[PDB]
């Protein structure tokens, strides 16, 4: 919902292994306009490959993300959510903390007030848990059985209020201050 959030994505999707040149401003107009035209975020293969190709030229249409697309695995009309695919992409690439956070909170801060609800947290945790294959999921600890018990706990951690709201700072200071949340929000 803002060019700023585009920057955070630049450095992130940049160190990953690709190399997008489009400044953060471009992703801003493209992102919104992209989800604005689509229904809610459902895209097809013929379309995704085109986005990953332009976003990352020197990287081969099958370098890293090649696996991600597999994890999701379509299952209806041959389409898949894009927003989730993105968040998943970013969250898990393995990197600093506040980097993926401030980006996640800003990503949900579309254009209205300036806060995020529990249901939103769950959506994210669902994006990563799904990003994981039912095979590597058996290795995860027991305190992560499902995005439901994992999101609820996180909420009872920095939320301090059942079904409440988190502000930009709160969210950040919530993961940085408490190590648990940080380990319950940033992938493993
Ligand atoms: C508000 O306008 C949020 C804008 C965020 C833009 C960065 C996300 C767009 C890049 C997604 C990467 C997809 C790789 C195929």
Is the shortest distance between the CB of 6 and ligand 1 below 6 Å?
Answer: yes
CA-nearest residue for atom 5, ligand 1, is 6
| 42-47 contacts at long range (C-beta below 8 A, 24 or more positions apart) | 42/77, 42/79, 42/80, 42/81, 42/82, 43/79, 43/80, 43/82, 44/78, 44/79, 45/69, 45/74, 45/78
Map residue 48 onto helix, strand or coil. Answer: helix
Q: Cα(110)–Cα(20) distance, rounded to whole angstroms?
A: 23
Question: Could you tell me how many residues make up the chain?
Answer: 188
Residues 6+ apart with CB under 8 A from 160: none
CA-nearest residue for atom 15, ligand 1, is 52
Q: Helix 24-37 crosses helix 3-16 at what angle (to 10 degrees)?
A: 100
Q: Cα(138)–Cα(60) distance, rounded to whole angstroms?
A: 31
- Report CA 43 to chain centroid distance, whole Å: 16
* Closest by CA position to 123, among listed 103, 148, 142: 148
Choose which CATH entry (1.10.760.10, 1.10.1040.10, 1.10.238.10, 3.40.190.10) describes domain 97-188: 1.10.238.10
Q: Cα(124)–Cα(51) distance, rounded to whole angstroms?
A: 22
By what method was this entry solved?
NMR
- Range(s) for CATH 1.10.238.10 in the chain? 3-96, 97-188
CA-nearest residue for atom 3, ligand 1, is 1
Is the shortest distance between the CB of 68 and ligand 1 below 6 Å?
Answer: no
Q: Judging by DSSP bridges, how do beta strands 166-167 and 80-81 pair with one another?
A: unpaired
Is the shortest distance between the CB of 1 and ligand 1 below 6 Å?
Answer: yes
CATH fold for the domain made of 3-96: Recoverin; domain 1 (1.10.238)
């Amino acid at each position: 919902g803002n060019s700023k959030s585009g920057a955070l994505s630049k450095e992130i999707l940049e160190e990953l292994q690709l190399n997008t040149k489009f400044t953060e401003e471009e992703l801003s107009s493209w992102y919104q306009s992209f989800l604005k035209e689509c229904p809610s975020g459902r895209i097809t293969r013929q379309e995704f490959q085109t986005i990953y190709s332009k976003f990352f030229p020197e990287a081969d249409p099958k370098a890293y993300a090649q696996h991600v697309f597999r994890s999701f695995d379509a299952n209806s009309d041959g389409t898949l959510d894009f927003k989730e695919y993105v968040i998943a992409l970013h969250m898990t690439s393995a990197g600093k903390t506040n980097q993926k956070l401030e980006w996640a909170f800003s990503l949900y801060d579309v254009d209205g007030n300036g806060t995020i609800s529990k249901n939103e947290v769950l959506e994210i945790v669902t994006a990563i848990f799904k990003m994981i294959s039912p095979e590597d999921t058996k290795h995860l600890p027991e305190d992560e059985n499902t995005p439901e018990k994992r999101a609820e706990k996180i909420w009872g951690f920095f939320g301090k209020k059942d079904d409440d709201k988190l502000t930009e700072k709160e969210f950040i200071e919530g993961t940085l201050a408490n190590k648990e949340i940080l380990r319950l929000i940033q992938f493993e």
